């Protein structure tokens, strides 16, 4: 997260921290149900083996064990069969979680689920949503921050993101662009798979999943997110 502010998991109780076995951070995710975390396929496409992954819920620091946190194994790693790639299509994935005790996540003050959107029902463009993650704080940074961060970006219409000086056609209707009017804040490397959360009809909703972007917080280069309200059938079937 470029700019923005630091926060603790309490403010984003659905945020999942995903790691791969050296134990290195991979990407974020979002808890949509006790046993299911949703994220981005590009984060695992190169190492599909579900055995190399560790998912944490209720964790606020990168390399420290936030008290009240829960460690899980990936029972099932479901990548979208139609994935293609920056410009990344169908960049969405599901991780079925279960602890060694063989159980799913238990809600608490630091562990909650996030509601899914209604099909093709997204906030009006210009709306302000939140993005959370352990991604770089600066494009030039070589390290990821130790403390969780979040910031605010505004939804951008596909017509405007479609423009050549922006992303041209690299962006599709299955994608949502979001950015700061001053391009002062944005998601960056390491935030992929993380949640783009918007308020809809008085309810925090998982409108997007950090997917890709040209650099970070660069003028005319929005952050691109997988448009969740366009993948509900896919999500429900694979989570039955």
């Amino acid at each position: 997260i470029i700019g923005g502010e630091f926060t603790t998991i309490e403010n984003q109780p659905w945020f999942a921290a995903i790691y791969r076995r050296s134990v290195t951070y991979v990407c974020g995710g979002s808890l949509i149900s006790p046993c299911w975390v949703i994220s981005a396929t590009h984060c695992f496409i190169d190492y599909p083996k579900k055995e190399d992954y560790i998912v944490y819920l209720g964790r606020s620091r990168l390399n420290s064990n936030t008290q009240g946190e829960m460690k899980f194994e990936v029972e099932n790693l479901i990548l979208h069969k139609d994935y293609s790639a920056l410009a990344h299509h169908n960049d969405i994935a599901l991780l079925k979680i279960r602890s060694k005790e063989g159980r799913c996540a238990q809600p608490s003050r630091t562990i909650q689920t996030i509601a899914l959107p209604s099909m093709y029902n997204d906030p009006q463009f210009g709306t302000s949503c939140e993005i959370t993650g352990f991604g770089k704080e600066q494009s030039t940074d070589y390290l990821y921050p130790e403390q969780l961060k979040m910031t605010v970006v505004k939804l951008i219409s596909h017509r405007e993101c479609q423009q050549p000086h922006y992303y041209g056609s690299e962006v599709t209707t299955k994608m949502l662009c979001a950015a700061d009017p001053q391009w002062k804040t944005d998601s960056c490397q390491g935030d992929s798979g993380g949640p783009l959360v918007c308020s809809l009809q008085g309810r925090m909703t998982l409108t997007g999943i950090v997917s890709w972007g040209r650099g970070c917080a660069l003028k005319d280069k929005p952050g691109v997110y997988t448009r969740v309200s366009h993948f509900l059938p896919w999500i429900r079937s694979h989570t039955k």
């Binding site: 920056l86 990344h88 494009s139 960056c188 490397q189 992929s192 997917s211 890709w212 040209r214």
Partner: peptide
């Protein structure tokens, strides 16, 4: 390899 989309990618 520095942008979103290429994390945890072998080539990188």
């Amino acid at each position: 390899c520095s942008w979103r989309g290429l994390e945890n990618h072998r080539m990188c």
